[PDB]
Amino acid sequence: RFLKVKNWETDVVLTDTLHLKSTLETGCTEHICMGSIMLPVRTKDQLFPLAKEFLDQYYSSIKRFGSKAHMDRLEEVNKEIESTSTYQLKDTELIYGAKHAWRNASRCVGRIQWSKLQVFDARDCTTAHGMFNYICNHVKYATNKGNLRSAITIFPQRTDGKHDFRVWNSQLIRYAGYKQPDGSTLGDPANVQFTEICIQQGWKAPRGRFDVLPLLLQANGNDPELFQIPPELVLEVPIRHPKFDWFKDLGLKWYGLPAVSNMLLEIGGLEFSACPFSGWYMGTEIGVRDYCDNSRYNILEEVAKKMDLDMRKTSSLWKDQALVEINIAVLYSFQSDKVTIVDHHSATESFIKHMENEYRCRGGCPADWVWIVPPMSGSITPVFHQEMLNYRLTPSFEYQPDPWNTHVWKG
Amino acid sequence: RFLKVKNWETDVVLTDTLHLKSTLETGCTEHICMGSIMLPTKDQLFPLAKEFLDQYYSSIKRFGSKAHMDRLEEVNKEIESTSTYQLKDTELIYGAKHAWRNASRCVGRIQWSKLQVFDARDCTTAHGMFNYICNHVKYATNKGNLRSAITIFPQRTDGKHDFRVWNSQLIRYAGYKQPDGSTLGDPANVQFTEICIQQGWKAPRGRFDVLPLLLQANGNDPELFQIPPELVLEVPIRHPKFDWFKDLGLKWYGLPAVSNMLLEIGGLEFSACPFSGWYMGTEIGVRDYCDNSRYNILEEVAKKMDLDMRKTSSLWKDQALVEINIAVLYSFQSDKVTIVDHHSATESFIKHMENEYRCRGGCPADWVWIVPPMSGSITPVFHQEMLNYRLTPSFEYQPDPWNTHVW
Ligand code: HEM
Numbered sequence: 156r157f158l159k160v161k162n163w164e165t166d167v168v169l170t171d172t173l174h175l176k177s178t179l180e181t182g183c184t185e186h187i188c189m190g191s192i193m194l195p196v197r198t199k200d201q202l203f204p205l206a207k208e209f210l211d212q213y214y215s216s217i218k219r220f221g222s223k224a225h226m227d228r229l230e231e232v233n234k235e236i237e238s239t240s241t242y243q244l245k246d247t248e249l250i251y252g253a254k255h256a257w258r259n260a261s262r263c264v265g266r267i268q269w270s271k272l273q274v275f276d277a278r279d280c281t282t283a284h285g286m287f288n289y290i291c292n293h294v295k296y297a298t299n300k301g302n303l304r305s306a307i308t309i310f311p312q313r314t315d316g317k318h319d320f321r322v323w324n325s326q327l328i329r330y331a332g333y334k335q336p337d338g339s340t341l342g343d344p345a346n347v348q349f350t351e352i353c354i355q356q357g358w359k360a361p362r363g364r365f366d367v368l369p370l371l372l373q374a375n376g377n378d379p380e381l382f383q384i385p386p387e388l389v390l391e392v393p394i395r396h397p398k399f400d401w402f403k404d405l406g407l408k409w410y411g412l413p414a415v416s417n418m419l420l421e422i423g424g425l426e427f428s429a430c431p432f433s434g435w436y437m438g439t440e441i442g443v444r445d446y447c448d449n450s451r452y453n454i455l456e457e458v459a460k461k462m463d464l465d466m467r468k469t470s471s472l473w474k475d476q477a478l479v480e481i482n483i484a485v486l487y488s489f490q491s492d493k494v495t496i497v498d499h500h501s502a503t504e505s506f507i508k509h510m511e512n513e514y515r516c517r518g519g520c521p522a523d524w525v526w527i528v529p530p531m532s533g534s535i536t537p538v539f540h541q542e543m544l545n546y547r548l549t550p551s552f553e554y555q556p557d558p559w560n561t562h563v564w565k566g
Numbered sequence: 567r568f569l570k571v572k573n574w575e576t577d578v579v580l581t582d583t584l585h586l587k588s589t590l591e592t593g594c595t596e597h598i599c600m601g602s603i604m605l606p607t608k609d610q611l612f613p614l615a616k617e618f619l620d621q622y623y624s625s626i627k628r629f630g631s632k633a634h635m636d637r638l639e640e641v642n643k644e645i646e647s648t649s650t651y652q653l654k655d656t657e658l659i660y661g662a663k664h665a666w667r668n669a670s671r672c673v674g675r676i677q678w679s680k681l682q683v684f685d686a687r688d689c690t691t692a693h694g695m696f697n698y699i700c701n702h703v704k705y706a707t708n709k710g711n712l713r714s715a716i717t718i719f720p721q722r723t724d725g726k727h728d729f730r731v732w733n734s735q736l737i738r739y740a741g742y743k744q745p746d747g748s749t750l751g752d753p754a755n756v757q758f759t760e761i762c763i764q765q766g767w768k769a770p771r772g773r774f775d776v777l778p779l780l781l782q783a784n785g786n787d788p789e790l791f792q793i794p795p796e797l798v799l800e801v802p803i804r805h806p807k808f809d810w811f812k813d814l815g816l817k818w819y820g821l822p823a824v825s826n827m828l829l830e831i832g833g834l835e836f837s838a839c840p841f842s843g844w845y846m847g848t849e850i851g852v853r854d855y856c857d858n859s860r861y862n863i864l865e866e867v868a869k870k871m872d873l874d875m876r877k878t879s880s881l882w883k884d885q886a887l888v889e890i891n892i893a894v895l896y897s898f899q900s901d902k903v904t905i906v907d908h909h910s911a912t913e914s915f916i917k918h919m920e921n922e923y924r925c926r927g928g929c930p931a932d933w934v935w936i937v938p939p940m941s942g943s944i945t946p947v948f949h950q951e952m953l954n955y956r957l958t959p960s961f962e963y964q965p966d967p968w969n970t971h972v973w
Pocket residue numbers: 253257260262263264265266268272305306307432433434435436437440497502526552
């Protein structure tokens with residue numbers, strides 16, 4: 156079957172055949188679309204088809220399909236499964252899998268970069284201290300003094316689900332959130348619950364607006380352990396505005412390295428429950444969502460108040476006006492400090508080029524419009540006018556429930 | 567099967583049971599989501615009529631009444647006999663209001679029950695359509711105090727005698743493909759502005775020329791009519807701060823009046839059913855003014871603001887976009903013409919969603935269309951999970967007449 160997408164700004168039409176290789180489900184049916192829904196122990200019965208499919212893909216990509224090398228590997232993986240009820244990926248396979256998980260991440264606008272991922276194999280890791288060391292090296296490598304580099308560090312796969320490796324942090328670097336008795340919040344409200352856990356686990360909280368959280372690391376299903384990232388490794392950027400001198404005095408800064416650490420990497424049926432990865436920021440992640448979401452730092456009012464905007468009626472668009480300057484300031488600051496960042500205009504433009512290239516060479520590019528379109532200035536970016544097909548390919552990054560909701564405490 | 571939707575800004579969770587009464591298809595499957603795709607006989611008819619009459623008589627607290635059964639058999643007889651049927655006025659009004667209530671892409675549905683329905687089913691000629699439409703326009707505009715309205719022309723019979731309004735909106739500005747290669751007026755209407763001239767219009771080849779109506783009655787060739795200028799309320803666009811803004815020479819019309827959709831009620835098809843409400847500011851300022859394939863004035867406005875247009879990372883496009891949308895709102899409000907900003911409208915819709923979940927068991931909503939084209943995540947609807955499904959009565963899309971007209 157053929158599927159056509161259209162760009163209503165340029166009238167370019169692309170044809171999707173890749174969706175036929177789609178395994179997983181969307182959540183949608185013929186009778187309901189769950190396109191805007193945010194979130195819509197494995198036996199051997201189902202493992203070998205998943206392994207075979209991955210290896211068929213792998214050996215196609217290296218143009219060795221049906222080769223003796225291909226067949227032996229299948230045989231090898233096969234025996235290893237029914238002998239051990241799992242199997243191990245070769246280094247080459249792991250690298251391929253991680254890159255393609257990224258390539259398949261339909262909610263990621265940054266995928267033009269997917270082929271240049273630095274994969275750190277941490278499958279020989281056994282303890283939380285080992286995890287901390289690997290993560291430090293990831294952060295140092297990825298940060299690269301502000302010239303950021305995409306990286307992923309992959310810890311050992313799940314076995315019985317009773318020995319999981321997990322990073323309890325949602326990102327490697329994030330600021331603490333503290334709920335005050337008067338109901339207000341100090342720091343990042345998104346992180347209040349995790350902060351509390353850390354504090355409970357023995358973390359001594361500086362209780363400021365921008366405390367970098369400690370890593371909380373779980374190895375081999377053991378109780379997690381606290382570690383402080385060395386501050387010299389945490390690159391941060393003070394936020395100032397190129398024309399507004401009072402903006403510096405708002406006291407804002409942000410960290411340079413976005414490193415998501417709570418997702419699950421699936422490759423050939425194998426589940427890597429700890430696989431922190433990092434790229435670099437799109438400006439709006441910080442300027443729009445982190446600073447201006449009502450449920451986050453929520454600085455729109457103070458900025459608008461300092462701009463002397465008409466804040467009495469919404470139709471003045473004072474919120475809209477302050478939002479733009481804040482995002483200007485975030486971009487200005489990162490660029491002035493020579494820290495890699497991309498504006499939403501450049502990023503969406505690159506993604507369209509990527510997507511078109513993917514249709515030509517791959518026969519498709521699964522893409523989640525709801526997530527690809529930036530949280531401000533939607534229709535003046537080219538992805539707004541781009542029709543997209545969303546479907547799920549493997550290898551993939553998957554959501555997993557927060558570890559504190561499922562962890563069996565040892566003590 | 568009983569679905570939950572979460573607001574991630576407020577943690578509020580609503581349970582949706584209404585989707586289980588869905589009939590039409592979404593375009594989606596379990597394998598692929600098409601959520602961002604713009605455009606996905608006698609025996610067919612009676613279940614369709616029955617389903618509608620069921621929800622109608624249920625709605626008036628008379629489900630399973632004698633009148634219900636009587637109406638059912640009455641309609642069933644008329645179908646068996648005439649191969650179609652006619653709606654009672656009360657049912658027509660209900661169906662129209664509920665078509666609007668069911669429009670999953672419409673952010674303005676908190677107003678759905680306050681709709682003025684104009685029964686134009688006795689119309690027989692294009693001249694009659696023109697008269698009905700002028701009356702619609704005058705009533706809806708109401709000297710700037712806009713009132714929602716729909717005018718419903720005769721239903722389809724055998725597709726040979728369709729009533730169609732060839733305009734996409736009752737009021738739109740002309741677009742001309744210039745010799746030097748550019749485009750004067752509205753580029754979205756270049757083909758229609760051509761067809762108008764191609765059937766005898768005389769364009770004042772200006773920038774904001776209100777297009778003539780091209781009305782098709784009973785399957786006949788369509789006819790040109792000019793809306794009396796005094797019926798077309800326009801708003802000169804100035805900025806409350808930049809006095810050079812007015813020099814740009816921009817204005818827009820007060821009445822957004824979509825006229826190319828198909829209204830389906832109880833299996834009956836109304837191919838000519840122009841309806842109107844009032845603008846959300848971003849429709850004009852974000853889409854009509856700044857879309858690349860439209861008036862695309864961003865670069866011009868950015869210039870006069872003397873913004874750094876060297877690199878995209880200065881967000882000059884963004885900065886300009888906000889000021890433009892400030893001006894639109896400011897102009898309309900000054901001139902006492904109804905308009906809603908995207909903050910209040912999206913706030914209205916959340917409250918409306920709340921209401922619909924609470925009294926109806928849900929509210930079909932297309933997130934891709936409900937979220938405004940600017941400042942998305944600082945409006946409440948961005949953080950609102952929505953379920954999209956298709957309820958009847960409905961507004962549907964139909965081919966442009968000039969691709970189908972048995973000429
Ligand atoms: C290199 C520059 C990159 C940029 C500019 C970028 C940009 C983005 C943005 C803006 C989002 C939406 C995030 C949000 O709004 O919360 C996203 C999502 C995502 N990205 Fe990328 N990204 C980059 C690199 C990467 C890398 C290296 C990976 C993995 C190896 C990755 C995988 C993903 C995944 C799995 C999501 C979806 C998160 C979810 O499902 O909720 N990205 N990206």
